[PDB]
């Protein structure tokens with residue numbers, strides 16, 4: 123197999139062992155989560171961060187703080203992991219699907235505007251695979267129509283939009299550190315970021331059974347039982363062992379982004395000849411007029427077949443099989459039409475017509491791995507498999 | 518300070534280090550959670566178990582599977598941690614408080630029956646401190662009124678009721694492994710247990726984004742993208758590092774229950790002379806005719822002041838102060854009237870009048886530690902602090 127992702131180091135194993143043997147294992151008995159919060163906020167260009175159990179709970183707590191619920195429409199992408207949509211359903215709101223950009227796979231200002239109604243309250247925009255959304259256009263639309271924006275940053279650690287971290291631009295950023303993500307806190311983890319003090323206080327309470335931050339930290343208490351629960355909430359906390367991994371990985375992020383970026387550019391460079399021959403489309407953020415001064419996180423590397431130009435005996439799926447047969451990982455990538463899941467049967471939530479760009483990218487995507495442990499030889503194998511298979515197509 | 522709880526061993530540190538370095542860190546990339554589920558189910562006398570992020574999410578997923586929501590009343594206890602009540606509020610149902618037993622601190626068949634209505638659908642009974650509820654009475658009452666029962670077992674690992682593990686008697690058992698609990702999976706953790714296959718399938722899907730167990734494991738899959746999400750759900754999963762701790766601690770539970778029991782017996786025995794003198798009430802499960810062939814988990818050890826028999830210069834609160842001043846941990850214990858929290862302001866959820874037994878136990882409780890790391894000498898010091906302060910009261 124190729125070099126693993128995730129790939130935990132002895133430093134990380136020693137850190138979790140130390141946290142465990144300290145017995146200071148909980149948000150309320152140690153300081154690892156609290157220091158991870160302040161370090162993550164600084165790293166993500168945000169005033170506030172809160173450590174969460176996972177990226178789904180991060181979306182959930184953001185929707186809770188924004189008072190999104192029954193009768194509110196929230197614009198969502200069809201091209202993502204289901205949590206980016208089901209979080210909206212689970213709070214009782216109505217997800218409404220926008221189509222995506224043919225180059226980036228993200229929802230766009232134009233496709234969001236097309237599905238806005240007088241009931242739209244929110245947008246959950248996903249920075250898919252690490253390519254940032256057009257946040258100037260999305261925030262302009264949100265200002266015009268009085269909408270709240272949640273940036274789903276689960277695939278986008280290290281991405282920037284015109285000089286600032288993703289997750290710092292919308293009202294709230296939601297983050298995952300699940301097992302194969304760019305940051306990976308020991309099996310699960312998440313985070314929210316915000317610049318709004320009131321949204322921070324609301325999310326902080328909600329993930330801690332409705333403990334008021336003001337009651338805990340900003341109030342003088344008599345000895346004995348303390349009355350802290352000033353609203354209803356739940357347990358969406360992270361452990362100390364997950365947090366110490368997060369803190370370690372923040373310090374690695376420049377290295378990790380640089381390695382992902384180098385791996386991606388080697389693969390995109392090799393795909394260019396097959397774009398010239400008409401078999402691939404190879405969108406590159408660094409060559410985009412509209413994503414000047416932005417950076418791609420490179421969670422995963424997408425290119426797209428030009429189906430019309432493949433011989434009849436070839437297809438996207440056959441290319442995946444042939445690259446896999448040469449020992450190189452290759453996938454169809456993200457779900458592109460999550461609304462086709464049976465969860466949407468009889469809900470009235472499925473678009474009445476399939477979203478054409480989302481449908482096309484589901485059919486055309488080829489997805490490659492670029493994670494930081496991949497060796498020069500593994501990236502060479504990747505390039506050689508692409509050249510081998512497309513040379514077979516070309517003859 | 519007294520011996521710590523929790524108190525993680527080198528064996529546990531080495532196990533979490535091995536899980537991390539394996540890179541098999543997630544429910545979907547390793548087998549520690551799946552083996553913990555089957556071992557926990559067997560240990561807890563249940564056909565099915567599902568690993569959960571925490572005991573709050575265990576309650577939440579049980580209420581989801583039972584289709585409890587808007588317009589449904591659920592009987593709850595006032596004498597617990599808020600999650601036993603706020604889980605009901607958060608799913609949209611109406612918590613209705615029952616008073617508690619003066620000896621055991623648990624809701625009783627009599628006090629539950631007093632607050633039943635035709636809209637009651639469920640009971641969340643807490644085995645407080647490890648003393649099992651009257652499950653014959655509660656299940657009889659649930660049968661006659663067509664109610665579902667959730668056992669909140671967060672404080673009750675090792676408790677049995679007439680030969681059976683707690684958590685195996687109600688429709689669903691909810692469990693916590695939070696940091697100071699009898700089992701403590703490295704900062705957070707939870708579990709549900711059930712004997713009902715359909716409730717198991719529903720909870721298993723809901724904690725995993727609505728992945729159907731049938732779609733994942735009972736369906737032959739074509740190559741490429743698999744359509745699994747047949748209903749809506751969320752991410753309420755446990756990590757592999759938490760699960761390996763759970764598996765280790767299950768094997769220690771005979772020893773841990775025996776040590777907690779021996780510690781409790783020594784303290785209760787010392788309290789007997791002060792009960793004889795009228796200063797304490799010392800309920801003992803092993804002496805209760807109603808709790809024959811049952812066993813106490815001994816999460817914490819409660820006795821109760823007889824307020825009426827204390828001299829004017831004395832109080833429950835002064836006894837706590839004086840025992841702590843001798844170097845012995847002592848607490849007022851569980852919240853006894855959770856409905857007094859400001860979360861309940863303007864909800865209409867407060868009982869018309871304060872619940873009198875619950876109010877009394879909040880005023881009279883003295884709670885001592887009995888966790889398995891406490892040495893013979895620390896238990897001796899506990900007895901001597903009790904004897905010193907009560908000898909002062911007497912003389």
Ligand SMILES: CC(=O)N[C@H]1[C@@H](OP(=O)(O)OP(=O)(O)OC[C@H]2O[C@@H](n3ccc(=O)[nH]c3=O)[C@H](O)[C@@H]2O)O[C@H](C)[C@@H](/N=C/c2c(COP(=O)(O)O)cnc(C)c2O)[C@@H]1O
Pocket residue numbers: 176177178179202203204205206248274276277297298299300301302310311312453454455456457489543545741742743744745752
């Ligand atoms: C355990 C784990 O690693 N889960 C990650 C994984 O989810 P998974 O269940 O495989 O979902 P899908 O990618 O829809 O795949 C469905 C099925 O098709 C198969 N498949 C998939 C792709 C493919 O190319 N080929 C294929 O055969 C899969 O093997 C699986 O059998 O892939 C997702 C993209 C990740 N995304 C999470 C996440 C959250 C939620 O964060 P959280 O996981 O709660 O921290 C929030 N927003 C965003 C934009 C997120 O990305 C999940 O964390």
Ligand SMILES: CC(=O)N[C@H]1[C@@H](OP(=O)(O)OP(=O)(O)OC[C@H]2O[C@@H](n3ccc(=O)[nH]c3=O)[C@H](O)[C@@H]2O)O[C@H](C)[C@@H](/N=C/c2c(COP(=O)(O)O)cnc(C)c2O)[C@@H]1O
Pocket residue numbers: 148150346347348349350357571572573574597598599600601643669670671672692693694695696697705706707848849850851852884
């Ligand atoms: C981080 C941690 O260890 N939390 C545990 C702790 O909750 P805590 O926030 O302290 O809540 P309370 O006991 O109501 O105390 C409120 C305040 O008064 C203070 N206090 C409390 C008691 C006292 O004697 N003196 C005092 O000064 C506390 O320090 C705090 O400042 O004490 C609770 C009893 C535990 N209960 C858990 C659990 C779940 C929920 O499971 P989960 O915690 O989500 O796994 C579900 N059902 C059940 C029957 C559960 O037991 C919590 O796990």
Ligand SMILES: C[N+](C)(C)C
Pocket residue numbers: 165166167279280281282286287
């Ligand atoms: C530091 N960062 C803005 C690139 C995340």
Ligand SMILES: C[N+](C)(C)C
Pocket residue numbers: 560561562674675676677681682
């Ligand atoms: C049933 N028991 C093994 C938990 C005692």
Ligand code: NA
Pocket residue numbers: 584
């Ligand atoms: Na109903």
Ligand code: NA
Pocket residue numbers: 634635636637638662663
């Ligand atoms: Na009823």
